[PDB]
Amino acid sequence: GPLEDSAEAERLKTEGNEQMKVENFEAAVHFYGKAIELNPANAVYFCNRAAAYSKLGNYAGAVQDCERAICIDPAYSKAYGRMGLALSSLNKHVEAVAYYKKALELDPDNETYKSNLKIAELKLREAP
C-alpha cells in the first residue's frame, strides 16, 4: 500500500522528526535508525538521519546516508542538498558544488542551496 513493519517504521520516523524539532539529534538518529531497520526502502529515513548526523558533526555518516537516499530515489533533491552540506563540511568543496547544482536543477527555487553553493564556490577558490 501507500506505506505492520512499514506502519511502525513511519511512527518511529515521526518521533525522529519530533526529536529534531527540540534539537535532540542523538535521539533523532536513534529513531530514524529504528525506522530503517523495519523499512530500509524509504529514502526519507536516510536523508533525515543524515540531517541529524550533520547536526552532530558526523558528516561522514551523513554522506553515506545521502548516497543511499539518492540511490533509492535519484530525484530526491533534498538528499543532494544535504550531501552538498556534508561534503562542504568535510572541505570537499568541488564535489559539494556538483551536488548543490544537481539539487538546484531539481529544486530551482531553494535559496538554501543557492547560498551554500556560493559558500562552497568561495571556499573552493582558496584551494591550490
UniProtKB/Swiss-Prot annotation:
Asked if the keyword Lyase belongs to this entry, the reply reads no
Biased composition, class Basic and acidic residues, residue ranges: 8-18
The reply to whether Nucleus figures as a keyword in the UniProt entry is: yes
One GO biological-process annotation of the entry reads: negative regulation of ubiquitin-dependent protein catabolic process
Where do the TPR repeat units fall? 9-42, 43-76, 77-110
MF terms (GO), sorted A to Z: BAT3 complex binding; identical protein binding; molecular adaptor activity
Domain of life, source organism: Eukaryota
Q: Which residues carry this modification: N6-acetyllysine?
A: K55
- Assigned GO CC terms: cytoplasm; cytosol; membrane; nucleoplasm; nucleus; TRC complex
Question: According to its UniProt record, in which tissues is this protein expressed?
Answer: Ubiquitous.
Give UniProt keywords alphabetically: Acetylation, Chaperone, Cytoplasm, Host-virus interaction, Nucleus, Phosphoprotein, Repeat, TPR repeat
- The signal peptide stretch is none
Q: Where does this polypeptide localize?
A: Cytoplasm; Nucleus
Q: What does this protein do?
A: Co-chaperone that binds misfolded and hydrophobic patches-containing client proteins in the cytosol. Mediates their targeting to the endoplasmic reticulum but also regulates their sorting to the proteasome when targeting fails. Functions in tail-anchored/type II transmembrane proteins membrane insertion constituting with ASNA1 and the BAG6 complex a targeting module. Functions upstream of the BAG6 complex and ASNA1, binding more rapidly the transmembrane domain of newly synthesized proteins. (Microbial infection) In case of infection by polyomavirus, involved in the virus endoplasmic reticulum membrane penetration and infection via interaction with DNAJB12, DNAJB14 and HSPA8/Hsc70.
Question: What is the protein's quaternary organization?
Answer: Homodimer. Homooligomer. Interacts with DNAJC5 and DNAJC5B. Interacts (via TPR repeats) with HSP90AA1. Interacts (via Gln-rich region) with SLC2A1. Interacts with HSP90AB1. Interacts (via TPR repeats) with HSPA8/Hsc70; the interaction is direct. Interacts with BAG6 (via ubiquitin-like domain); interaction prevents interaction between BAG6 and RNF126. Forms a multiprotein complex, at least composed of DNAJB12, DNAJB14, HSPA8/Hsc70 and SGTA; interaction with DNAJB14 and HSPA8/Hsc70 is direct.
Q: What is known of its domains?
A: The second tetratricopeptide repeat (TPR 2) mediates the interaction with SARS-CoV accessory protein 7a.
Family in the record: Belongs to the SGT family.
Q: What is this protein called?
A: Small glutamine-rich tetratricopeptide repeat-containing protein alpha
Specify the species.
Homo sapiens
